């Protein structure tokens, strides 16, 4: 049981990290596009 | 008749219109192209420079030279009347039964206002759904929010139709105040297919339950915004009926998962940053604004009861949709895939199910007096027999204690007779008689959860399922 | 000197405000932000360009407006006034007294970020410290100049262990053959996001021991502004380095909760919009923590020493 | 015991006068020193 | 037992602080007499010169209305505008080209900005 | 005031123009309906206002007016016996105005402006006053409501109102500089109220339950946490805390509960009666209610409003207990608000400043010396509801790093009919060592060692459960069977408590000390009997066991004689019987 | 530049039984030693610096503790060179850029060390190069990319990290120098995951 629980915890952490990285990249690119479209005009 | 021209941008579901300061936020507009076709849309953002409109359907024929936009409604409203009973609508109030449109008594905003907590009162009476597993063990109380958790291939639609067909109140059992209030069912379907639509139409027409219900039907190919709007239309109708005409209203919402996916698509369309696991961060608040519209109110006889139905994505209860639904509602009904594959219908699994308001709607003066103790004893006995069914596979039947054979037989007969009721409709008394007949197979004195007087009143009966419980 | 006031504030949001025509602000300078009611709160320049300058406010920006607020330069680099008379005093973690006594008279003013020690100027630590705990003394021996943190959890008694170590620490010159009797350690105690219960425990234990006359306290309570939590360890280590390497003191530095410091750093980095690390923490957390931890040690040709015992709680162990 | 505490209080209230007596001999010189620097 | 030692320490610290506050009070009160005595014409001119040197793009020079007999000639020396504000006594302040940046050169500000180094220095003389 | 117009509407976010001079986090009224909002960002002549309520039907160009003040509450007579929302709006008045629904844009006053109050002056003209002092007294449901000068107000009294009947709005005391002080003032909810000094926790917060009081005590001005599993009696335990606590005033905050749960707490409370006076318990409480469908901002500000009211009543020199119904729902509201502002999530979607907010909320509790020279305290008991009963959830981890006590409710014990259903494993208190001197001085010199003996007996019972499960209790040696039976005696006679019994619902410290003394005396005499030769089953039938079992349900004034008789019976019996 | 590269056929004797027996590394080879904190990367690298058959040892303290570089300075002059018999420090070159030193210098230190190693190879010696931690160099690259407003690839690292690492590690190997002599460079890099 402890081995399975450790594996589950590790997998959950990896998935959450990948989700956070994707969200950060999406926000960065959206910010850059919005800058180009609104500040530079 | 003011009409706006000068579209400056069209891409995907959105189009930008200039010089549109007069449009109110959230208004509904009509879009007409050069070929005379009319499309719908909603204003999702208003500014001095332009207004942003989300088109309901595809934008295939649009162009920047001839398209025009005209206002329809400042805020989404629905015409309601007592004559809506027996009708069918497409999810934005448009009739689809081929009958003339209703004549409204009034027009109400579909985004209803929250109830005042000091105006609420405690639920006190139950609803007889006709299913023994629900009425006896997971009783539904007027004003409760009791969702149903189902899998992918499980027959949730059949159970929904059966409940809508068989649900009724029991003013007779109240003893005093033996008078019935009018009862009605509001049925909302979101993201259903053609086969499900035909099945529901035939099921409602064949029995005559249509004359006592209102149907809001939204198909899979319909616009997503209509999927968002459908439950609000249904709840507006339900609130109007219950709190103006003193009706007891039962509201059934099918496939809240489809609603959640529609909300996710809409959120992605407005360029909102998605929350955890891809769903919008305000999903909990949005779901609460739907679920929390049921209840009972002081000084009024009507009531609203909700039975949301949702299919878990991967049978995973930790998914955000069932998790939030559990946060908001007062229990759940769980369907079992093993019971379905074994041929037992309806495949409701009593062990993982629970109704939090059950204790307040059962007992003396509300139902038959021994309800709670019988439910507890049934749960205990079934749970004890289920694991013996596994232990026998390794130790053999001959190695059992004598009471363990009784528990095995009780579990098998319980599955065969109590849960597997088929399409028949059972009253509360008949279900309790079947429960007592099942309990009589256990030795007296093993009923640790029941008082002796109740046992002396009701013990000692053979199976009434074959007899039909006369 | 004379003050310059900048009134061209362009944009305020969260913990950041933009000053438009402030080309004269040095990068990293400390400023004073005065609003309409006269209340003054501190800030720091974190990015400056010809278009505007970016100032990070040390507390919440409630009550600021673009019409009446003004910004004034204080100094080009953050500095702290230090003196031997700091021993026995008590501070709020920003350098301001709280024990009701008048402010000290500075002997020197030093940058709080310090400067890196030249590796050829260090010497190898050699002196055994007897802490009175066998598990440490025999198996995990502590030496003057070492930085040796304590890893604990939610309910574990790390504070009691730290107090016992501070009480029982000694040098044992006879074994080493030094022979020279030495003064006891001076204790520099920095608290970050500490509660009233733990603060009272520490204060009472120090009073019972009698080490307050040898101690300097920087206390940042848990209800204090979160941004000021960054500067507390730097001020404490500036004082410790000054004492040790200009007055030959043997200093023992105790940092109450580095977890709160890291949480504050993450909160700042999220607002600044930097590249996250492994679990949302800023990517430069290693360098930031190193600039704090590396200030301990011993210096060749000098007698003083700095020893650090940071305390942190491992989240969920 | 408490007698040593009373002696220490006596010493403290003696120092509270000795310090200001020392300071009062040169105060205006410091005033002039500060004034010559604060003024341009 | 060390309670008496700490009592002595706090007593002497409070005495030293009370001495220093009196020193600064005498300094500021003596400084306040400059506009009343015939000492202003040079100190105010030097403060204005410092203010104008610190902010090269100066537009206007707001100073004491009592210095106007000198300001009306000293402003045209540099060619900048002049304004008066009674609340700014014992000080001269110059605004920027746009007015967003202002330099203030009052004597009170000079004292309260140098007071830390002056407190460090006076302890050498008093004790 | 600063007035502007709308130039852009997008969901709950409204962008105004022409609002130069507006201050951060001020309250603004948007449109002709006067929807309330908060300023969150400023740039140029533009302000970002976050509207609380729904913004359907608004149009570009409608006026926006700023009030120039942040979110705040009114503090004065008339807060007791009332039910408020998350931003201090009286729900009864709202019902009497708009029926069963809550319409957008309703304005009502927190304190009833019409009711007269009996003023009794305390100051005289020419008296110098300073923030925190008492200006006079007004009676309120048997309480002496002391009118306090606002914390920042200072001056000298010019005029005093003579004693009589006055409304809340009437200026009562006028200072020489022209400032007017009335029976109420206004204070921002996000700034802590000042005090002279925080005193260390040295006296227990007597909860009235033996398990809580003896094994996991909470000090006055302390903090505690409690899980909320269904069917575990959490509501009953909180209700008993409200009824039987040492605290003079009770504040209960609902911050996003289900509609039916809030209905239950709103209906059950008006029936309760406090034992101190026998009157309605509602005369000592303030209720703050929030359902799941209420606006997010109200849910977020509910706990701050509640703790501000608690701090006010503490400033009046009282002892206040504050219960937060579920900090998890408040954290959910905070996460939603953070997601609205497009902030970068830290861990599991929560904003990076969640721990800071929780610590800042919990640090308002404590026992302090008020600015008026009196003594008061605020004690916070916060319930935490993790998703699956998993305490690795970030909110639970953040809470456990700052609270001093943790009371693990368990559903299994409730299913076993052991009430209150609090595990002695997992639960812990950090206040025991600090409170021990008070115990030695006040209840008994031997209380801590006796409590340690109880804890060691429980631990010894828990340390041999595997063999009992494998084999069974009857097939055990005399020592092990005696130990497990003593543990059963403890569980069923000292830990258990019936909240519905007239004299068992409350238990003093002396009574618990007597129970522990009796149990230890019996155990030691039984071990001596085993040493001198006995069979355990013979010991099981001694009537002293039935005396100890019936030691509950006795009157506290009858307890000393009962305890003496029980001790004499215990001493005599083990010599008359083997 | 070099004249030609040769296949390595002689062992780089590290003085440790397990490394020299089970997992040998050749003179022109490359080796990576990753591990958690406290595992023994730095001690192993210092042991290789003290006991090895290489003529010249180049040690690059990229972003690590200052005490680790002070210990070498203090104690190496007291030791003996295994081959020449002189002081050990006479064959050692230290490049030190500690943790609290400027971040951007971590990248430069690696290149300085490897260029010095290549020069001593061109003189005809056998050189061993120890890189104390390449993870700090990667962190410096991540910081610089953050300031440049680029797009991260994995865990915030720039997409060109692997190319930089490959370019650094490819400078190793046994070669024929432009003077016709033979020399080699051995790179042992530590990683801190
Ligand atoms: N300490 C107690 N003494 C007497 N009765 C109790 C006690 N604790 C719980 N109960 C019983 O349980 C009841 C209500 O609490 P219950 O254990 O059913 O969980 P709950 O409080 O309803 O659920 P939740 O904890 O989620 O609010 C009451 O009917 C009461 O009789
Ligand atoms: N071969 C060894 N013989 C004896 N002790 C060793 C050996 N390797 C490591 N150690 C022990 O480990 C500690 C030093 O480990 P080291 O500094 O090598 O770890 P590290 O991998 O460099 O970690 P970091 O990179 O975080 O510094 C010392 O206490 C040392 O005694
Ligand atoms: Mg290392």
Cβ distance G152 to A29 less than 8 Å, yes or no, reads: no
Which of C56, C264, B296, C177 lies closest to F352 in space, CA to CA? C264
Domain that holds residue C217: 3-317
Task: State the smallest CA–CA distance between residue B166 and chain F in angstroms.
Answer: 26
Interface with chain C: mutation pick from F3, F18, F223, F344, highest number of C CBs within 10 Å: F344
CA pair distance F431, F446, nearest whole angstrom: 18
- Contact between C107 and E120 using a beta-carbon 8 Å cutoff: yes
Q: Are B428 and B375 in contact (CB under 8 A)?
A: no
CB contact under 8 A, G151 and A28: yes
For residue B422, give the nearest of B350, B335, B344 by alpha carbon: B344
SS3 G124: coil
State the Cα angle at G183 between G180 and G184, rounded to 5°.
145
C88 touches E at CB < 8 Å = yes
- B190/chain F closest Cα distance in angstroms: 22
Kindly tell me the number of DSSP H helices and DSSP E strands found in chain C.
Answer: 7, 18
Radius of gyration of chain A (CA): 18
C134: contact with E, CB 8 A cutoff: no
CB within 8 Å: B295 and F259: yes
Spatial distance between the Cα atoms of B38 and B31, rounded to a whole number of angstroms: 6
CB F404 within 8 A of CB C159: no
Mutation to probe ligand 1, out of F233, F242, F503 (largest number of atoms < 8 A from CB): F233
Please tell me the number of the ligand nearest to residue G17's CA.
2
Q: Is G90 exposed, middle or buried (0-12, 13-18, 19+ CB in 10 A)?
A: exposed
d(CA B207, CA B259): 29
**Residue C101 main-chain phi, psi, to 5 deg:** -85, 160
Assess whether the previous peptide bond of F420 is cis (omega < 30° from 0). Answer: yes
The answer to whether the beta carbons of residues E61 and E52 sit under 8 Å apart is: yes
CA–CA separation, C165 and C150 (whole Å): 11
How does DSSP assign F9-48, residue by residue? EETTEEEEES-TT-BTT-EEEETTTTEEEEEEEEETTEEE
Residues B237, B67 contacting (CB under 8 angstroms): no
| CA-closest candidate to residue F294, choices B115, B294, B281 | B115
β-sheet bridge partners, residue B306: B145, B251
Q: What are φ and ψ of residue F66, in 5° steps?
A: -100, 135
C-beta separation of F162 from F128 below 8 A: no
> Domain locations in chain B?
1-459
Q: DSSP characters for F343-376?
A: PPP-BTTB-TTHHHHHHHHHTT-EEEE-TTS-EE
Give the C-alpha separation, F354 to C267, whole Å.
10
Cβ of residue G67 lying under 6 Å from some atom of ligand 2:
no
Look at the block and give the residue holding tokens 């730290």. C162
**How far is CA C153 from each of CA C135, C150, C158, F112, rounded to the nearest angstrom?**
19, 10, 8, 49
As a whole number of angstroms, the distance between CA A30 and CA C230 comes to: 31
Contact B248, B302 (CB under 8 A): yes
Dihedral angle over CA of G49, G54, G55, G57, nearest 10? -30
Q: Which of E12, E18, E26 sits opposite D15 (nearest CB)?
A: E12
> Within 10 A of G9 (CB to CB), how many other CB atoms are there?
9
Q: Using alpha carbons, select from C288, B182, B122, D40 the residue that is nearest to residue E109.
A: D40
Tokens, residue G109: 């230190």
**Gap between the Cα atoms of F253 and F273, Å rounded:** 20
Judge: F23–C64 Cβ closer than 8 Å, yes or no. Answer: yes
Dist. CA F311–CA F249, nearest whole Å: 11
* Distance of alpha carbon E119 from the chain centroid: 16
Axis crossing angle, helix E3-31 with helix D27-38, rounded to the nearest 10: 50
Residue from A12, A20, A30 to probe the interface with C (highest C Cβ count within 10 Å): A20
**CA distance linking residue G27 with residue G7, whole number of Å:** 10
Tokens of F143: 């309480």
For CA atoms C37, C43, C45, C46, the dihedral sign is: negative
Burial tier of F63 (Cβ tally within 10 Å: 0-12, 13-18, 19+):
middle
| F330 sits in which H/E element | helix F327-340
Give which of C242, C232, C193, C67 is closest to F24, Cα–Cα: C67
- Ligand 2 atom with the smallest distance to the CA of G68 is 17
Give start and end residues of each alpha helix (H) in chain E. Answer: 3-31, 40-54, 68-78, 107-126
CB atoms within 10 A of CB A26: 12
Nearest of C188, C232, C181, C222 to residue C206 by alpha carbon: C188
Distance CA F124, CA F276 (A): 35
Residue G41 in 3-state DSSP? helix
Q: Are strands F173-175 and F180-181 parallel, antiparallel or unpaired?
A: antiparallel
Handedness of CA F504, F509, F514, F518 (dihedral sign): positive
E strands, F44-163, are 46-51, 63-66, 72-75, 83-84, 117-121, 128-130, 134-140, 143-148, 154-160
Which two structure tokens, joined as six digits, stand for A20?
A: 């956070």
Kindly give the residue spans of alpha helices, DSSP state H, lying in F383-532.
394-400, 411-415, 432-442, 447-462, 465-471, 478-490, 509-531
Give A10 Cα–ligand 3 centroid separation in angstroms: 26
The span from the CA of G65 to the CA of G101, in Å, is 10
What distance in Å separates the CA atoms of residue F21 and residue F9, rounded to the nearest whole number? 21
CA dihedral G25, G30, G32, G38 (to 10 degrees): 70
DSSP of B162-178: HHHHH-B--GGGGSSS-
Report the C-alpha gap between F239 and F395 in whole angstroms. Answer: 24
C69 to each of C7, C47, G176, how far by Cα in Å?
Answer: 7, 20, 71
Contact assessment for residue F194 and residue F151, using Cβ atoms and an 8 Å cutoff: yes
Kindly report the protein residue whose alpha carbon is nearest to atom 6 of ligand 2: G40
The dihedrals phi and psi of C33, each to the nearest 5 degrees, come to -110, 110
Report CA dihedral (G172, G178, G180, G182) to the nearest 10 degrees: -10
> Which residues of chain A make contact with C276, given a CB cutoff of 8 A?
20-21, 24
For the CA atoms of A5, A6, A9, A14, what is the dihedral angle to 10 degrees? -140
Q: Would you say F94 and F106 are in contact if contact means Cβ atoms under 8 Å apart? A: yes
- Cβ proximity of F420 and F208 under 8 Å: no
Instruction: Quote the DSSP letter at residue F401.
Output: T
F338 contacts: CB under 8 Å, gap ≥ 6? B281, F345, F350, F351
* Overall number of domains in chain C: 1
- Coarse DSSP helix, strand, coil percentages of chain G, rounded to the nearest 5 percent: 40, 25, 35
d(CA F447, CA F450): 5
User: In terms of DSSP bridges, do strands C90-91 and C215-221 run parallel, antiparallel, or are they unpaired?
Assistant: parallel
Cα–Cα distance for residue pair B240/B27, rounded to 1 Å: 23
The β-bridge relationship of strands C108-111 and C250-255 is unpaired
CA atoms of C45 and C77, how far apart (whole Å): 10
> Beta partners for C298?
C305
The answer to whether F458 touches F487, Cβ cutoff 8 Å, is yes
Question: Please, are residues C70 and C7 in contact by the beta-carbon 8 Å criterion?
Answer: yes
Residue with CA nearest ligand 1 atom 8? F233
Q: Does B291 touch chain F (CB under 8 A)?
A: yes
- Taken in order B39, B44, B45, B46, the sign of the CA dihedral is positive
Give residue B460's region: left, alpha or beta (phi > 0; psi -120 to 50): left
Question: Residue B170: which region, alpha, beta or left (left: phi > 0; alpha: psi -120 to 50)?
Answer: beta
| Tokens coding C24 | 């004269």
Interface residues from chain B to A (CB-CB < 8 Å): 271, 273-274, 276-277
Q: Tell me the residues of G at the C interface, defined by beta carbons under 8 Å apart.
A: 65-67, 69-71, 73-75, 96, 98-101, 103, 136, 139, 142-143, 145-146, 152, 155-156
DSSP summary character for residue B276: G
């Amino acid at each position: 049981i402890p081995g399975i629980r450790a594996q589950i915890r590790f997998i959950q952490q990896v998935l959450e990290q990948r989700e956070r990285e994707d969200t950060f990249r999406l926000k960065r690119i959206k910010g850059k596009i919005e800058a180009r479209e609104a500040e530079e005009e | 008749k003011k009409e706006y021209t000068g579209i400056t941008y069209i891409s995907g579901p959105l189009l930008f219109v200039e010089n549109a300061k007069d449009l109110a936020y959230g208004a509904i507009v009509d879009i007409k192209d050069g070929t005379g076709r009319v499309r719908g849309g909603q204003v999702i953002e208003v500014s001095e420079e332009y207004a942003v409109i989300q088109v309901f359907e595809e934008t295939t024929g649009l162009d920047l030279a001839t398209t025009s936009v005209s206002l329809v409604e400042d805020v989404a409203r629905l015409g309601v009347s007592k004559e809506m009973l027996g009708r069918r609508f497409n999810g934005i109030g448009k009739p689809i039964d081929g009958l003339p449109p209703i004549t409204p008594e009034k027009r109400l905003p579909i985004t209803g206002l929250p109830l005042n907590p000091v105006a609420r009162r405690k639920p006190e009476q139950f609803i007889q759904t006709g299913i023994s597993t629900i009425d006896v063990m997971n009783t539904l109380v007027r004003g409760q929010k009791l969702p149903i958790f189902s899998g992918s291939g499980l027959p949730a639609n059949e159970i929904a139709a059966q409940i809508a067909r068989q649900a009724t109140v029991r003013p007779d059992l109240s003893g005093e105040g033996e008078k019935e209030e009018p009862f009605a069912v509001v049925f909302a379907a979101m993201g259903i297919t053609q086969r499900e639509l035909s099945y529901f139409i035939q099921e409602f027409e064949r029995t005559g339950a249509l004359s006592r219900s209102v149907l809001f039907l939204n198909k899979a190919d319909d616009p997503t915004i209509e999927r968002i709007l459908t439950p609000r239309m249904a709840l507006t109708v339900a609130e109007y009926l219950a709190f103006e005409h003193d009706y007891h209203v039962l509201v059934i919402l099918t496939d809240m998962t489809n609603y959640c996916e529609a909300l996710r698509e809409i959120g992605a369309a407005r360029e909102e940053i998605p929350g955890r696991r891809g769903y919008p961060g305000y999903m909990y608040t949005d779901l609460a604004t739907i679920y929390e519209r049921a209840g009972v109110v002081e000084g009024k006889k009507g009531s609203v009861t909700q039975i949301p139905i949702l299919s878990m994505p991967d049978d995973d209860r930790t998914h955000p949709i069932p998790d939030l639904t559990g946060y908001i509602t007062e229990g759940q009904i769980q369907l079992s895939r093993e019971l379905h594959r074994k041929g037992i219908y309806p495949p409701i699994d009593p062990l993982p199910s629970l109704s939090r308001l059950m204790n307040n709607g059962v007992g003396k003066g509300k139902t038959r007096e021994d309800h709670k103790q019988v439910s507890d004893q049934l749960y205990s006995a079934y749970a004890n027999g289920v694991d013996i069914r596994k232990l026998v596979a390794i130790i053999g039947e001959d190695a059992l204690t004598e009471n363990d054979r009784r528990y095995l037989q009780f579990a098998d007969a319980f599955e065969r007779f109590f849960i597997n009721q088929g399409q028949q409709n059972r009253s509360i008394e008949e279900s309790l008689q079947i429960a007592w007949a099942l309990l009589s197979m256990l030795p007296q004195g093993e009923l640790k959860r029941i008082s002796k007087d109740h046992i002396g009143k009701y013990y000692g009966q053979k199976l009434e399922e074959i007899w039909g419980a006369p | 000197l004379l003050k310059k006031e900048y009134t061209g504030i362009t944009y305020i949001s969260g913990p950041l405000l933009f000053v438009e025509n402030a080309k004269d602000l040095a990068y990293g300078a400390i400023v004073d932000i005065k609003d309409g009611t006269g209340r003054v709160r501190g800030g720091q320049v974190i990015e400056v360009s010809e278009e505007y300058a970016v100032i990070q406010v040390f507390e919440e920006t409630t009550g600021l407006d673009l019409a009446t607020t003004s910004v004034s330069l204080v100094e080009d680099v953050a500095r702290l006034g230090v003196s031997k008379e700091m021993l026995g005093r008590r501070f709020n973690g920003i350098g301001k007294p709280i024990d009701g006594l008048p402010p000290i008279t500075p002997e020197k003013r030093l940058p709080i970020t310090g400067l890196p020690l030249n590796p050829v100027a260090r010497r190898k630590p050699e002196q055994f410290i007897q802490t009175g705990i066998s598990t440490i003394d025999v198996m995990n021996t502590l030496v003057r100049g070492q930085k040796l943190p304590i890893f604990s959890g939610s309910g574990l008694p790390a504070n009691e262990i730290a107090a016992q170590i501070a009480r029982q620490a000694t040098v044992r010159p006879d074994l080493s053959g030094e022979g020279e009797k030495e003064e006891p350690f001076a204790v520099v105690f920095a608290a970050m996001g500490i509660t009233q219960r733990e603060l009272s425990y520490f204060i009472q234990e120090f009073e019972r021991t009698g080490a307050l006359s040898r101690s300097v306290l920087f206390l940042n309570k848990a209800d204090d502004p979160t941004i000021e939590r960054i500067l507390t360890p730097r001020m404490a280590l500036t004082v410790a380095e000054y004492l040790a390497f200009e007055h030959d003191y043997h200093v023992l530095v105790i940092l109450t909760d580095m977890t709160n410091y890291c949480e504050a750093l993450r909160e700042i980095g999220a607002a600044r919009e930097e590249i996250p690390g492994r679990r949302g923490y800023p990517g430069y957390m290693y360098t930031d923590l190193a600039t704090i931890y590396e200030r301990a040690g011993v210096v060749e040709g000098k007698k003083g020493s700095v020893t650090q015992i940071p305390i942190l709680s491992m989240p969920d162990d | 015991t408490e007698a040593l505490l009373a002696r220490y209080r006596e010493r403290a209230e003696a120092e509270a006068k000795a310090v200001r007596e020392k300071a009062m001999a040169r105060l205006d010189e410091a005033v002039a020193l500060v004034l010559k620097e604060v003024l341009p | 037992e060390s309670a008496g030692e700490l009592l002595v320490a706090t007593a002497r610290t409070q005495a030293r602080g009370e001495v220093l506050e009196e020193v600064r009070r005498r300094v500021r009160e003596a400084l306040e007499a400059l506009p009343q005595k015939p000492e202003w014409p040079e100190v105010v001119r030097k403060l204005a010169l410092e203010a104008l040197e610190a902010l090269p793009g100066a537009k206007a020079l707001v100073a004491n209305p009592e210095d106007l007999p000198h300001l009306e000639a000293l402003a045209r020396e540099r060619g900048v505008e002049l304004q008066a504000e009674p609340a700014l006594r014992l000080g001269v302040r110059a605004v920027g080209a746009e007015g967003k940046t202002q330099v203030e050169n009052s004597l009170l500000a000079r004292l309260d900005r140098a007071w830390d180094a002056l407190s460090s220095k006076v302890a050498q003389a008093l004790w | 005031m600063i007035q502007g117009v709308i130039q852009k509407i997008a969901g709950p976010a409204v962008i105004a123009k022409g609002m130069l001079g507006a201050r951060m986090y001020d309250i603004c009224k948007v449109g002709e309906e006067g929807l309330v909002g908060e300023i969150i960002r400023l740039d140029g002549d533009t302000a970002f206002v976050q509207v609380y309520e729904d913004t359907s039907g608004l149009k570009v160009g409608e006026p926006v007016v700023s009030t120039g003040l942040p979110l705040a509450v009114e503090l004065g007579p008339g807060m007791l016996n009332g039910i408020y929302d998350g931003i201090q709006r009286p729900l009864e008045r709202i019902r009497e105005k708009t029926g069963i629904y809550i319409t957008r844009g309703v304005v009502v006053h927190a304190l009833d402006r019409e009711k007269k109050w009996a003023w009794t002056p305390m100051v005289k003209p020419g008296d110098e006053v300073r923030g925190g002092m008492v200006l006079g007294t007004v009676p309120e449901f048997g309480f002496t409501h002391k009118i306090l000068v606002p914390p920042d107000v200072r001056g000298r009294v010019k005029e005093v109102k003579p004693a009589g009947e006055y409304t809340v709005e009437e200026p009562v005391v006028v200072l020489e500089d022209g400032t007017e002080l009335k029976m109420y003032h206004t204070w921002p909810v996000r700034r802590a109220r000042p005090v002279q000094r925080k005193l260390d926790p040295n006296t227990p917060f007597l909860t009235g339950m033996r398990i809580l009081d003896v094994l996991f005590p909470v000090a006055m001005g302390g903090t505690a946490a409690i899980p909320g599993p269904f069917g575990a009696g959490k509501s009953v335990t909180q209700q008993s805390l409200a009824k039987w606590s040492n605290a003079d005033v009770v504040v209960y905050v609902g911050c996003g509960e289900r509609g039916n749960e809030m209905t239950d707490v709103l209906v059950e409370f008006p029936e309760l009666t406090d034992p101190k006076t026998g009157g309605p318990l509602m005369h000592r409480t303030v209720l703050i209610a929030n359902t799941s469908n209420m606006p997010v901002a109200a849910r977020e500000a509910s706990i701050y409003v509640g703790v501000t009211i608690a701090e006010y009543f503490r400033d009046q020199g009282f002892s206040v207990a504050l219960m937060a119904d579920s900090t998890s729902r408040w954290a959910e509201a905070l996460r939603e608000i953070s997601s609205r502002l497009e902030e970068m999530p830290a861990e599991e979607g929560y904003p990076p400043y969640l721990a800071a907010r929780l610590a800042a909320f919990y640090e308002r509790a404590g026992k302090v010396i008020t600015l008026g020279g009196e003594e008061g305290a605020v004690t916070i008991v916060g319930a935490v509801s993790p998703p699956g009963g998993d305490m690795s959830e970030p909110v639970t981890q953040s809470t456990l790093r700052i609270v001093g006590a943790f009371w693990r409710l368990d559903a299994s014990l409730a299913f076993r009919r052991h009430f209150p259903a609090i595990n002695w494993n997992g639960s812990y208190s950090l206040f025991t060592s600090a409170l021990d001197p008070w115990y030695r001085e006040n209840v008994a010199e031997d209380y801590p060692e006796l409590r340690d003996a109880i804890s060691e007996l429980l631990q010894r019972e828990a340390g041999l459960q595997e063999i009992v499960q494998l084999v069974g209790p009857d097939a055990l040696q005399d020592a092990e069977r005696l130990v497990i039976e003593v543990g059963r005696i403890i569980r069923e006679d000292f830990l258990q408590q019936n909240a519905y019994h007239e004299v068992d619902a409350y238990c003093s410290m002396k009574k618990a000390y007597g129970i522990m003394k009796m149990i230890l005396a019996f155990y030691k005499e039984a071990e001596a009997a085993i040493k001198r030769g006995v069979s355990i089953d013979e010991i099981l039938q001694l009537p002293v066991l039935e005396r100890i079992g019936r030691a509950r349900y006795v009157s506290e004034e009858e307890f000393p004689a009962y305890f003496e008789e029980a001790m004499k019976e215990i001493q005599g019996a083990f010599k008359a019987l083997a």
